[PDB]
Every structure is written in C-alpha cells, then in structure tokens.
Structure 1
C-alpha cells in the first residue's frame, strides 16, 4: 500500500494497538503494509525511529489542549493540559511507554516555549514555572504508566488471592480498580495546582 509518512504512521499505530510496544516490530509492520522488509527500510530505518515518530504524532493528533485559551487562568490551563495529555497517552496501547522515549522535536520546543512564556506572564519565575509544568507532566505520566503497565501485567501473571489481603488494602484496591485511575488522577491534580498557587502567592514570605 501507500508508504508516505502519514500512511506508515497510521499502519504502525494500528499495529501498536494490536501488539503493544514490546511486540511492535518493523517485520510485522512490513507484513501489515504488504511490502518486503528492505522496502520498509527505505521509509523507516529501525524500531527506535518508528517509536520517535509515533510519540510525536500521538501528541500532535490527540493532545489538543497544549496551549492556553485567550484569557485562561494558569490554574485552568494546567488542569486542561493535564487532562488532554492523559487522554492522549491512554488513546493507544502502551502509549505512555511510547511517549517516555520521545526525541527532541522542534515543534514540541515551540509549544513548551509558549507554555513557559504563559506561566512567566502569570507571575511565575522561570524556575517555578518550569517546576510546575514538570510536576504536572511527571504526575500525569506516572499515573498513566501505572494504569497501562498494570493492564500489561494482567496479560502475563494473575492478581494475588483476595483472602489474605488486610482490610484497608482490600478497600484501596477496590477503589483504585473501580475506574482507569481518573478519580485519583483528578483529585491529585487539584492538590498539585493548589500547592503551586500557595507557593506563587507567598513571594518571599515564609510559607
């Protein structure tokens, strides 16, 4: 079939949902596109190049709240960006692991520049602006990776017998498995934003 960049990325993302990141190979991608391996090689050098392109493409296509709206608060921007980032990572099987090996992308640098500009215009030092954006990224990626890797582990092993669990852990596992982590994620996200605001408003005061 067609081997323009867009068609190859489309095929590879479909293959990722079929196999997961560990099972995704250039050999399987060639099969899916109906070509020989040295044909594919002209388009796609190796698995690493393929993953770098998927990582960038997943955010380009599906992370559509990367920029603040006109007049938006920095609180609302971090909340909206975090929810978008999390949705984008959950959209594909092992998506967060695909992201975790992104390369530098010039277009992602212009976006982070706009986000750091926005934070500093709203009163953040460059340091505190970067720390806030980083913490939101770290928290969000950590929450998604724990959801996706736990799913991936239920593919291989089981989950331990319920009847030796102490009571609060039993109830905690009931709560953490009652959704895809969304309630926990949204609650932690409010805690993180409010922490940042207490720090911003403190200026040089002991806090």
Structure 2
C-alpha cells in the first residue's frame, strides 16, 4: 500500500490499537502495510523513531485545545487544555505511554511558550505559571496512565480478594469503577485550578 508519512502513521495507529505499545513491532507494521521489513526501514528507522512520530501525530491530530480562545480566562484555558490532552491520550491504546516516551519537539516548546506568555499576562510569575502548566500536565498524564495500565494489566491479573475488603475501601473501589475515572479526573482538575487561583489571588500576602 502507499508509504507516504500519513499512511504509515494511519497503519501504525491501527496496529497500536490492535497490539498496544509493548506488542507494536516494525515487523508487524510491515505485514500490515503488505511490505518487506527493509522496505519499511527506508520510511522509518526503528520502533523508537515510530513511537516518537506517533506521539507527535496523536497530539497534532487530536489535541486541538493547545491555545487559549479570544478573551478566555486562564482557568477555563487550563481546564479545556487538560480535557483535550486527556481525550487525545485516551484515543489510542497505551496512548499515554506513547506520549511519555518522547521529548517535546520545537512545536511543543512554541506551544508551552505561548501558554507561559498567556499565564504571565494573566498575573502569574514566570515560576508560578510554569508550575501551574506542569502540574496540570502531570495530574492529567498520571490519571490517564493509571487508567490505561489498569486496562493493560487486566489480561494477566483477575480481580483480587473481594471477601477481604474493609468497607470504606470496598465502597470507594465500586464508585471509581462506575465511570473509569472521568469523575475523579474532573473533580481533581477543579481542585488544582482553584488552588492555583488562591495562590495567584494572595499576590505577596502569606496564603
């Protein structure tokens, strides 16, 4: 089949949904594209290069709330940015593990620069704007990684000692399972953003 950049990525994302990150191999990708491995090699050197391209392409295609809307509050921006980030990472199997394995490229540095300019124009110190951006990223990535690695584990581990659970824990585990963690995520997000606001709002006052 065609081996333009776009088609190679389309097949690689299809393979990633089939195999997950550990099972994705250039051999399987060649077979899916109907080509020999040395043909694929001309197009993409190794699994590392493929995963780096997939991470960038997952965000470029599906993380579309990178930049604040005209006159958007910093609160609303961080919220929409986090939801778009989570949604992009959840779109492919082990998508967060794909994102984790890559260094930010020139385009990701430009995006953080725009975000940091925005935060500082909204009254954040440089340090505090970057800590807010990093905290939202760390929280969102951890939430998604815990959700996808729980699903990956479900292959080799059944569910564990039911009979044994103490009662708050048992009820808690039932609540988190009702919705695969969207509620936990959205609640935690509001907490994080409000915390940033209380800190910013103090200015130089002890808080």
Q: TM-score range by the shorter chain?
A: over 0.9
In 1, distance between residues paired with 2:156 and 2:65? 35
In 1, distance between residues paired with 2:8 and 2:186? 35
In 2, distance between residues paired with 1:61 and 1:180? 24
Cα displacement (A) at 1:104? 2.9
Q: Which runs of 4+ in 1 moved over 3 A?
A: none
Cα displacement (A) at 1:83? 0.4
In 2, distance between residues paired with 1:167 and 1:198? 35
1:177 aligned counterpart, secondary structure? helix
Cα displacement (A) at 1:82? 0.4
Cα displacement (A) at 1:159? 1.2
Residue 155 of structure 1: aligned partner: 155
2:72 aligned counterpart, secondary structure? coil
In 2, distance between residues paired with 1:180 and 1:130? 29
In 1, distance between residues paired with 2:29 and 2:103? 21
TM-score of the pair, normalised by structure 2: 0.99
Deviations 1:38-63, CA, capped at 9 Å, x for gaps: 00000010000000000000000000
In 1, distance between residues paired with 2:125 and 2:154? 44
In 2, distance between residues paired with 1:153 and 1:203? 45
2:142 aligned counterpart, secondary structure? helix
In 1, distance between residues paired with 2:182 and 2:148? 13
TM-score of the pair, normalised by structure 1: 0.99
Residue 69 of structure 2: aligned partner: 69
RMSD between aligned residues: 0.7
Cα displacement (A) at 1:161? 2.5
Residue 82 of structure 1: aligned partner: 82
Q: Mind listing any 5+ residue stretches in structure 1 that lack a counterpart? A: none
Indicate yes or no: 2:200 matched with 1:200. Answer: yes
Q: Mind listing any 5+ residue stretches in structure 2 that lack a counterpart? A: none
In 1, distance between residues paired with 2:135 and 2:190? 12
Moved more, 154-163 or 114-123: 154-163
In 2, distance between residues paired with 1:94 and 1:172? 25
Deviations 1:110-139, CA, capped at 9 Å, x for gaps: 111111111010001110000000000000
